[PDB]
Amino acid sequence: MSQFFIRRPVFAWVIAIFIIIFGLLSIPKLPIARFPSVAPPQVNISATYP
Amino acid sequence: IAKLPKGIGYEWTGISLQEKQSESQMAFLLGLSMLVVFLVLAALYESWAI
């Protein structure tokens, strides 16, 4: 209920600060790639009969 | 080792490698814990200084 937070701005600001800190921690450790693992996986068996 | 003859290198092994890759982690975690405690206490007391 917004009335809880209107009379208690500090606790609303604390929630936002927690979210901001968590996101700033997450961004550095997120992998970066053009596309996710979209292609079907493949397993290859290689045999030799010289 | 850097003062040794050319062509001779080195590698850390065992707990040494773990220590090398765990530098400053304790300080970062301590700072983050202090920040989280401050935020929680500010939320509890509805004050930025208490």
Side-chain angles (χ1 to χ4, degrees):
Chain A
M1 187 66 204
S2 296
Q3 183 62 255
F4 173 105
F5 301 100
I6 297 169
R7 294 179 66 188
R8 277 177 272 251
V10 170
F11 192 125
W13 268 120
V14 159
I15 293 176
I17 296 165
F18 266 117
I19 298 169
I20 292 162
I21 294 318
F22 283 160
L24 290 184
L25 295 191
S26 289
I27 291 181
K29 233 111 301 303
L30 288 171
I32 297 169
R34 179 156 134 82
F35 290 118
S37 294
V38 176
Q42 295 179 329
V43 188
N44 319 282
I45 312 149
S46 295
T48 310
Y49 185 75
Chain B
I1 295 160
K3 295 163 57 194
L4 276 176
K6 176 75 167 306
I8 298 296
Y10 69 112
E11 289 204 56
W12 293 113
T13 185
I15 62 170
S16 294
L17 205 62
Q18 304 176 323
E19 279 204 18
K20 192 80 48 171
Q21 293 179 356
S22 77
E23 296 293 328
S24 296
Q25 289 198 3
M26 185 64 72
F28 173 83
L29 287 166
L30 283 175
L32 177 81
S33 191
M34 293 177 71
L35 178 53
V36 170
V37 166
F38 176 75
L39 283 186
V40 167
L41 283 178
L44 177 63
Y45 293 130
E46 294 294 328
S47 181
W48 283 126
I50 292 189

